[PDB]
Design a protein around this ligand. Structure first.
Ligand code: FAD
Ligand code: NAD
Ligand code: NAD
Length: 450
């Protein structure tokens, strides 16, 4: 660990890596240090809830290689270890390169003196710095307030480590319960459901909302989705409010506020994330009270010499207003954009990032913009043409293929492409134009629906 380094990147996930690759591309001589709390070198997370589960290789938990949707096999890691330079070496080695100081944590930040202090006492000074701290899984107070007995049987899910433990458990218990109906809970339910199909074991998913992906999708579509998650071999329990959790003769017992009791062997809790904003205290950086995370401008800049990117960044979108996005692709785009800006670029966030998700073979979608079920929607499908806050939506209908528009005024500000491939460039085009559209059935033709 050197005492000075030109570019300091705090946090060793997706955003930070994208930043490093970007800086090097715009300054082929650059010297970049990543300080990373995790012992692991930068890796992507999506395969931990999706592809690593569907691998036919039994060695998959050691190899950590997966197949992409298009044949090509690869590693979970961004680069092979042999592509980074030592932390000690980084000041000298000609041409520079990227170093990763693994297993250390930044615990104090002094913006005045361009300096960080590590948890071991080390101090580093910097010319340019990026916070890319990500966030931590939220906990359930019903679990927080229980005993060792309970907590020992409870998983949060974020790291490679978590994928090794849960994969092991799935192979040796009879029943697992997922608590949460968002992205992680739902994707996990499917992966575990396809696994339980072989052994005839059970998988329960329960949550407060009426159906999966309640905070993202309109009610009709969220309902349609839940039915598909069931068909993956999952026992879905909507409208469940967890009251308490204890053990009874070696088993977990979940008690719902409705009087029902759920018995199970293990619990995974997917109930959102808390953005990692500890450094904001000592650094004296503005936190956003509405969205959470560090408040930064359109260029991801907080103070001079310091930028924020990824899950921890609340930024200004010139086109869609202030936001904070927590998705893989956004981490890449914003990390890459901060890299450019740390090497003088000065460009505002403009190329919109996107996301995607899959729940069994029949639910596959991509999305862009402000995609929030609390906004008015207009949806258009190969069966019906439904509006929600050309008529009001009917559950039980066929919703296998369509596009859903999310509105502010007459302006489309978010789109979800529902089992439709290869039309993302047009979704981008529509968000960018920001026209007040007369008839959205016209706009929908752009996506081949009809
Ligand atoms: C299982 C899983 C599946 C996902 N799948 C998808 C998907 O399919 N599609 C999609 O769009 N998104 C998905 N996401 C989101 C994706 O994982 C991105 O990683 C995340 O949105 C952005 O990563 P980031 O670099 O901003 O933060 P992170 O990847 O969280 O990295 C931050 C790193 O900083 C370290 N750190 C924190 N504080 C400090 C500190 N103070 N000092 C030093 N180090 C610190 C943390 O340990 C962490 O390693 C998924 C997430 C998970 C967990
Ligand atoms: N495909 C994807 O984009 C994808 C996949 C996996 C993970 N991720 C990321 O992983 C992170 C965390 O995943 P997540 O699904 O936990 O976050 P999330 O925000 O999607 O989940 C929020 C869900 O937590 C549940 N919840 C909140 N409070 C609860 C409570 N008190 N009791 C019971 N349930 C409660 C609700 O069901 C709510 O919908 C997110 O950043 C997510 O974007 C994304
Ligand atoms: N779009 C997706 O469904 C998807 C899937 C996995 C990962 N990602 C991630 O998103 C980022 C860039 O997005 P991208 O859209 O250019 O990724 P990509 O390179 O996979 O896109 C290529 C095209 O493949 C299309 N496609 C056609 N048939 C598909 C199928 N059967 N299953 C999945 N996709 C199919 C997608 O719609 C996309 O337009 C990358 O980080 C990538 O890893 C996207």
């Amino acid at each position: 660990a050197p005492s000075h380094v030109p570019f300091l990147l705090i946090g060793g996930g997706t955003a930070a890596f994208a930043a490093a690759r970007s800086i090097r591309a715009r300054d082929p001589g650059a010297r970049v240090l990543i300080v990373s709390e995790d012992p692991e070198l930068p890796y992507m997370r999506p395969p931990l809830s999706k592809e690593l589960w569907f691998s036919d290789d039994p060695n998959v938990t050691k190899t950590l290689r997966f197949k992409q949707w298009n044949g090509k096999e690869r590693s979970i890691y961004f680069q092979p270890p042999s592509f980074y330079v030592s932390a000690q070496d980084l000041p000298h080695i000609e041409n520079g390169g990227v170093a990763v100081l693994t297993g250390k944590k930044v615990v104090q930040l002094d913006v005045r003196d361009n300096m960080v202090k590590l948890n071991d006492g080390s101090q580093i000074t910097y010319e340019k710095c990026l916070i890319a701290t990500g966030g931590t899984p939220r906990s359930l107070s019903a679990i927080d307030r229980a005993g060792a007995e309970v907590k020992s049987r409870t998983t949060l899910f974020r790291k490679i480590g978590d994928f090794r433990s849960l994969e092991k458990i799935s192979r040796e218990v009879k029943s697992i319960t997922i608590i949460g109906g968002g992205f992680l809970g739902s994707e996990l339910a499917c992966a575990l459901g396809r696994k339980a199909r072989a052994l005839g074991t059970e998988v329960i998913q329960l949550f407060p909302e009426k159906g999966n992906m309640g905070k993202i999708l309109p009610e009709y579509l969220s309902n349609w989705t839940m039915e598909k998650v069931r068909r993956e071999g999952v026992k879905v329990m909507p409208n469940a409010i967890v009251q308490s959790v204890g053990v009874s003769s070696g088993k977990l017992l979940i008690k719902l506020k409705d009087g029902r009791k759920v018995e199970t062997d293990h619990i995974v809790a997917a109930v959102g994330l808390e953005p990692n904003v500890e450094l904001a205290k000592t650094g004296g950086l503005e936190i956003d009270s509405d969205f959470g995370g560090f408040r930064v401008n359109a260029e991801l800049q907080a103070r001079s010499n310091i930028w924020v990117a990824g899950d921890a960044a609340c930024f200004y979108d010139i086109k869609l207003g202030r936001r904070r996005v927590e998705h893989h692709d956004h981490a890449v785009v914003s990390g890459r954009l901060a890299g450019e800006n740390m090497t003088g670029a000065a460009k505002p966030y403009w190329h919109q990032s996107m996301f995607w998700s899959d729940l069994g073979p029949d639910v596959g979608y991509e999305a862009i913009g402000l995609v929030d079920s609390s906004l008015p929607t207009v949806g258009v499908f190969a069966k019906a043409t439904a509006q929600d806050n050309p008529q009001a939506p009917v559950q039980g209908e066929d919703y296998g293929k369509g596009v859903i528009f999310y509105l502010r005024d007459k302006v489309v500000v978010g789109i979800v492409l529902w089992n439709i491939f290869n039309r993302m460039p047009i979704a981008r085009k529509i968000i960018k134009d920001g026209e007040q559209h007369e008839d959205l059935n016209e706009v929908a033709k752009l996506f081949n629906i009809h």
